[PDB]
Every structure is written in C-alpha cells, then in structure tokens.
Design a protein around this ligand. Structure first.
Ligand SMILES: Nc1ncnc2c1ncn2[C@@H]1O[C@H](COP(=O)(O)OP(=O)(O)OP(=O)(O)O)[C@@H](O)[C@H]1O
Ligand SMILES: Nc1ncnc2c1ncn2[C@@H]1O[C@H](COP(=O)(O)OP(=O)(O)OP(=O)(O)O)[C@@H](O)[C@H]1O
Ligand SMILES: N[C@@H](C[Se]CCNC(=O)OCc1ccccc1)C(=O)O
Ligand SMILES: N[C@@H](C[Se]CCNC(=O)OCc1ccccc1)C(=O)O
Ligand SMILES: [Mg+2]
Ligand SMILES: [Mg+2]
Ligand SMILES: [Mg+2]
Ligand SMILES: [Mg+2]
Ligand SMILES: [Mg+2]
Ligand SMILES: [Mg+2]
Lengths: 267, 267
C-alpha cells in the first residue's frame, strides 16, 4: 500500500495533531480515510452539541477581556484605510512591505497593520483622557504573502499600546509576559529591526514570531502628531492559535470555509 | 448670534442625542462649543474609567452569546472572497448591487454580504452534523453607497440561518422576534423583494430597514449545492446601534477614528 500524493494530501487534511495515526503505517488509504472521517465528524458533532464557539472569535473575546480589565480602551477602527497612511508610515513605494499591500479603488487599501489607526487614536484621546492613554484593537489585517506554514493573506492582529507615563521597555515586557502567561504560551524576547519602527523586540515561540513590539519615541512620531513616550506590540491571533493547538499549518486557524476550529469541513 | 455652517457642523459633531441643547438658542458659538466639549470629555473619561468596551465589539459579543446559546454555530469566514461568488449569487454585472462591489486585485472583492460563505458552510456541515444545521456569522461587509444617514461603505453584518427541519416562515419570524426582543428594539415585518433572493421579509423600525430575511428553497440553491429547506436573515449592527442610541447619523456607530461610542474624538 503506497499512497499517492493526492491520497496523502487528503489524509493530511483530515489528520489532527492529537491523532496518533501515521499515514505510512501500511494500512490502505480507504481505512485511514474512513477512520479519520469518523473522528472528524465526531469532533465536529461534539463542538456543535457542547461549545459552538469559533476559535478566532473566542480568542478575540478572551483577549478583549484581558485588556479591558487592565485598563485599555477597546478600539474598532476602519479596515479599509487611505493609501496615504502607508506612505506616512514610512513604507516607501519600492520597499518590501509596500509590495504586500492590497489596493482598493484608487486611494485606499486594506490595512496591513493596526498601528496607523491606533496612532491617530492615541493622539486624539490624549486631548481628553488622563495619562496614561492605554488602547488596543483586534481585527483583520491583510498582506500579500508567499504563503508558507506561518503566513496568511488575511489574518487577525492584536495591537495594544500606551502613551504617556509608564512607557518603558520593562513595562512593555511586563505586559507581554502577563499576556502570554494568561494564554499559557512560553516565549522569549529577541532583538530585531524593521523599516517602519527601527529596532523591535520580537516575541518568539521557538522560531515562530508571535509579535513585534516597539518602545518609542521614534522620529516617525512627528508625522502622526505623537509627541510623548509610547510602547506598543502587534500579535497575530492565528499564530497564537497555531501554538495553542499544535497546528502544522496556520491555515487551520484562519478565516476559512475549509476548516472549522482546525477540523476539515470537507467530510 | 448667527452661526455659520462650519460652526453649526462643529456643534452637531459634539452634540449627543441625550443633550437638551439647541444650537439656535441664541447663545454664541464659543459658549455652546465649550459646554459641549466639556460634556463630551466627561463622557469619554467615564467610559475610560468604568467601561472601556466599544459599542460595535460589545454588540457583536452580545449577539454571539444569544445565537450560541440557542444552538447556532459561530462562523468566521473570509472577508476577501472570489469575485466569482458575486456572479454565482445571481448578481449580474450590470445590476445595481454589482456596481456597489469593492474589487480587490483581479478575481477577488470585499464581501458585500455574508450569504455566499454561509451557504457553503450549510452545504458542508450538512454532511457531518445532525438536522437542523444552525449557523451564524458577524463581521465586516462592504458596499459602495451614496452615503446617507443610514448607509456606510464599511458596515457589520449579522446573518443567522438554518437548513433542514424547522425552516418555516413562522420559525424565522419567531427567531427575529426573540432576537429583537432581547435587544429591546420594536419592529414590524413588511414584504419586499430583491434580486438575489426574490421575495424578502423586511424587518423595519419605522422607515429604517434593520434586516432582509428569506424563506427558502429558491431556484438559486442549486448553484450553491443547497437542496433542503432553509431560512436566514441579515442584519446591520450599525443600524441596530443607531436605533438603540438614537443617533441621527449612522456614522456615529461605525468603525471610525472620528467617533468613539458616538462621542466625537476631536476634542
Ligand atoms: N501574513 C501574516 N499572517 C499571519 N500573521 C502575521 C502575518 N504578518 C504578520 N503577522 C503577525 O503580526 C505580527 C506583527 O506584524 P509584523 O509586521 O511584526 O510581522 P512580520 O515581522 O512581517 O512577521 P514575519 O517576519 O513572520 O513576516 C507578527 O509578529 C505576526 O504574529
Ligand atoms: N451600506 C450599508 N450600511 C449599513 N448597513 C447596511 C448597508 N447595506 C445593508 N445594510 C444592512 O444589512 C442588512 C441586509 O442587507 P440587504 O442587502 O438587505 O440591504 P439593503 O436591502 O440593500 O438595505 P437598503 O435597502 O437600506 O440599502 C440590511 O437590512 C441593513 O441592516
Ligand atoms: N509592531 C507592529 C505595530 Se506596533 C505600533 C503601536 N501602535 C501605536 O500606537 O504607535 C504609535 C505610533 C505609531 C507610528 C508612528 C508614531 C506613533 C507592526 O509592525 O505591525
Ligand atoms: N438577506 C441577506 C442575506 Se440572507 C441568506 C442566508 N444565508 C444562507 O445560508 O442562505 C443559503 C443560500 C444562499 C444562497 C443561495 C442558496 C442558499 C442579504 O440580502 O444580504
Ligand atoms: Mg512579514
Ligand atoms: Mg518578522
Ligand atoms: Mg515583526
Ligand atoms: Mg442597499
Ligand atoms: Mg432594502
Ligand atoms: Mg434588504
């Protein structure tokens, strides 16, 4: 019993991390497929009977509660943003991130990050709210990618940020630590750099980048009317789910018609 | 004291429905503006101190709990969808809704409704789950609009639907009724029609359309592999918020950097 590539692909779609089933165990495709179909139907029936919550939606709600309870204001800002935000973010037209932008109409695009909208909120809210200003947003972001096991074209970003007092490296690391401890995810912090922000603190789980974080001020602040110390971090929710559920491919965690909570919908 | 159009616009931005303040009361602009700025800063400070939840996010969470508790599976599907879905939905290239579509790249668009993704889920889930199949989704949808007091280009749709047993007009009306009673919103049902679905039951609050709902089957089902009775309804969350909070302009409820929970962010 040698399986074709098409057969192995079909079994891999139906296989879940908790299965102790090897596709090369010598059993024929028909028996492996029947067993996995039965397991996945049972898994989906259990979700439908007892849970009914989508992993991405449930994780957004859990993260929302965590940040609201710690004094951060919940933001919901536009997903369709001016293309001018990309240039004012310092993303020059010939840079790598600029090629990843999904253009809409003529002057708009799908946001590839939450940062510009949140910078506008920090500036505006600092005229009305007491120091420090603490805000966060969770929602869809978009980048054209080569599509590996760790990138999606449509993903979900969390960005939390603070402006004013308490905007230090140690406070930023403390929030990241409390957040990932709340989710039960081990991590380390490594130095890296990017073009928008300069140096970042990257939050790594093994070789998987969970977040890039920044301690301001940076020279870019002036173009956004930011004139105080700030800290912020952006996390991909699908990457968090990939770690939590041991998914081999991030597509299992994505907005999709092909998987529900990591279970194939082709049953 | 006659106010210019620019001055009146500024005061209208700062005015909230609960204020018993008339912009034509004869008081000068400087006093009306100072009073309203003070009220709105206080309102925002109270939210920041005591609540911190965004109206759109909080309403999504409340609706999610309502449908999950009543046996509907929570869906999060792609916002960027194939342009082919628009033609297979019967939206011919020269129709009115087709002109409202935001195109992305060459073969994709921003979804103007949730229905096609949910039809795919109904079909797929019917192979695995017991009758009846009950699902819902909340999330961003996009339409180019003339932009009045009731339309946004970027809005948030709820669509709940069911396939199999219990897919009758009376059950559909009963779910709509239980849902709007839960939110405390009065309504009536009127007959209307649209091009995708044919006859609809429109859910009206006064002259404001809160939802269009459909009792299947319809001939379009075959193009989506739907072969059982079904019911479904789509609601705009920003319209629900407009009713709940007596907003004069739906922009107060939208994803925005210009308003937070209906309060101007230009303070
Ligand atoms: N295409 C993508 N798919 C899924 N998640 C992503 C994607 N791009 C970024 N993220 C998540 O958003 C976070 C903040 O975005 P950032 O700009 O730092 O990404 P990045 O450094 O380009 O990530 P990578 O180096 O893996 O491409 C990332 O740490 C990651 O968790
Ligand atoms: N541009 C929009 N902005 C905000 N909400 C909308 C918009 N278009 C539709 N909705 C909401 O989505 C629901 C379902 O969409 P549907 O296709 O029935 O809208 P519609 O009949 O085009 O609405 P209208 O007649 O007001 O344009 C509507 O009843 C409404 O609550
Ligand atoms: N690291 C993540 C995003 Se982190 C930015 C936190 N958001 C924020 O409010 O910054 C204020 C700010 C932003 C730009 C210019 C001046 C001031 C990423 O690369 O996608
Ligand atoms: N009235 C709202 C959307 Se209502 C559709 C409910 N969703 C669903 O699952 O329908 C099954 C289905 C859909 C199309 C073709 C065949 C079968 C609007 O106009 O935006
Ligand atoms: Mg990248
Ligand atoms: Mg990186
Ligand atoms: Mg990074
Ligand atoms: Mg319309
Ligand atoms: Mg209508
Ligand atoms: Mg309608």
């Amino acid at each position: 019993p040698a399986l074709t590539k098409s057969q192995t692909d079909r079994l891999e779609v139906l296989l879940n991390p908790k299965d102790e089933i090897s596709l090369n165990s010598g059993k024929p495709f028909r028996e492996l497929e029947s067993e996995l179909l039965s397991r996945r139907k049972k898994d989906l029936q259990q979700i439908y009977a007892e849970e009914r919550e989508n992993y991405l939606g449930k994780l957004e709600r859990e993260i929302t509660r965590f940040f609201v309870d710690r004094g951060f204001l919940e933001i919901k800002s536009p997903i369709l943003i001016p293309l001018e935000y990309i240039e004012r973010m310092g993303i020059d037209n010939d840079t790598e991130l600029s090629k990843q932008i999904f253009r809409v109409d003529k002057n708009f695009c799908l946001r590839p990050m939450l940062a510009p909208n949140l910078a506008n909120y920090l500036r505006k809210l600092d005229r009305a709210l007491p120091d420090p200003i603490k805000i966060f947003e969770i929602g869809p972001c978009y980048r054209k990618e080569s599509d590996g096991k760790e990138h999606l074209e449509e993903f979900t970003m969390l960005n939390f940020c603070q402006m004013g007092s308490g905007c230090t490296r140690e406070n930023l690391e403390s929030i990241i630590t409390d957040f990932l401890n709340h989710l039960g995810i081990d991590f380390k912090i490594v130095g890296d750099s990017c073009m928008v922000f300069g140096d970042t603190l990257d939050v790594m789980h093994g070789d998987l980048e969970l977040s890039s974080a920044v301690v301001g001020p940076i020279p870019l602040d002036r173009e956004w009317g930011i004139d105080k110390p700030w800290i912020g971090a952006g996390f991909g929710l699908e990457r968090l789910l990939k770690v939590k559920h041991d998914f081999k491919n991030i597509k299992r965690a994505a907005r999709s018609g092909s998987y529900y909570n990591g279970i194939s919908t082709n049953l």
